[PDB]
């Protein structure tokens, strides 16, 4: 028969308890300012397709960033704008400053606060053990906030995490794939980026929830402490599940598919093979031994689980002993 149902363990019904206007993004009507108010200064690298520029707000001469919206459905523009406005002021969420259009092209664009980011590739090579705990904790604050606001990010990855390393400031960006969580709703599995896709996406299980972002977060933790980046390096969506199964084990994969009555694409049986669940200690060697603590492995083991419902929530993750060194006492 069909796949078994599933529900988020936390924040499941929060959107139904809010006004419909909160989550009914198709009824949202943005106000499009004049993009001429922001003089572009330099282009900022965001892939071969997305066009993002640093600019100056000539009204107050403040640094901003302008993201020209790729030709996509207006429905998806409204979704991203509504989600950004619902999340504005949240901890470590990128602040949407303005929604503008170019007077000539009429192309919609988003204006964000500027953060003096350093690209993760060079940053990951110099992060200390404390840096990893600190920035993972700051990222967890953003994920717990947006989940508590009934929103899945669905594209968590190092490229979408701006870090001002000198100011110790972090922002979660790129909410163009984010969605509102509603219990029993089936979602598109063609989300996130290959290396950070959870097993539910790869096996085409559509009734997923906030725990998808927690798998992606676990992949980032694994690449930071083990220094293998990305940690699961699939050549495509099919091979990506094999890379996961070579670590978590194939028998545990089949146990997950049986629990939720998930039909496996038979092509996976051509490439999966049989693999035991590996101990996380097997990935330690001289180049990463200084970053792989007992609590780091215990947290990673509780994040990188096939069963999305058994993964730690963002809040449970924040309460894990791994973050004890960075849990600050209440101010004032
Ligand atoms: O799509 C989005 O939601 C989105 C949001 C923000 C940014 C964004 O990128 C930056 C980059 Cl790539 C480099 C630098 Cl040096 C600074 C910034 C920055 O300040 C900034 O806000 C990019 C995309
Ligand atoms: Cl606005």
Author numbering: 3 to 334
From the paper:
In this regard protein kinase CK2—a cell-stabilizing EPK accumulating in cancer cells that apparently exploit CK2 activity to escape apoptosis and to assist DNA repair —seemed to be an exception. Since in all known CK2 crystal structures—irrespective of whether based on the isolated catalytic subunit CK2α or on the heterotetrameric CK2α2β2 holoenzyme—the activation segment and the helix αC obtain basically the same conformation which is characteristic for an active EPK. Thus, the classical conformational switches of EPKs are not used by CK2α which is consistent to its constitutively active nature. Previous analyses have shown that CK2α—in spite of a conspicuous overall rigidity in comparison to other EPKs—has structurally rather variable regions.
The two CK2α′Asp39Gly/Cys336Ser structures and two of the CK2α1–335 structures contain FLC21 as an ATP-site ligand which allows comparisons between the two human CK2α isoforms. So far this “Arg47-down” conformation did not occur in complexes with FLC26; if this reflects a significant difference between FLC21 and FLC26 (which cannot be clarified currently due to the limited number of complex structures with FLC26), this would be surprising because it is the Cl8 atom of FLC21 that is in atomic contact to the Arg47 side chain (Arg48 in CK2α′) and because bromine—the Cl8 equivalent in FLC26—generally forms stronger halogen bonds than chlorine.
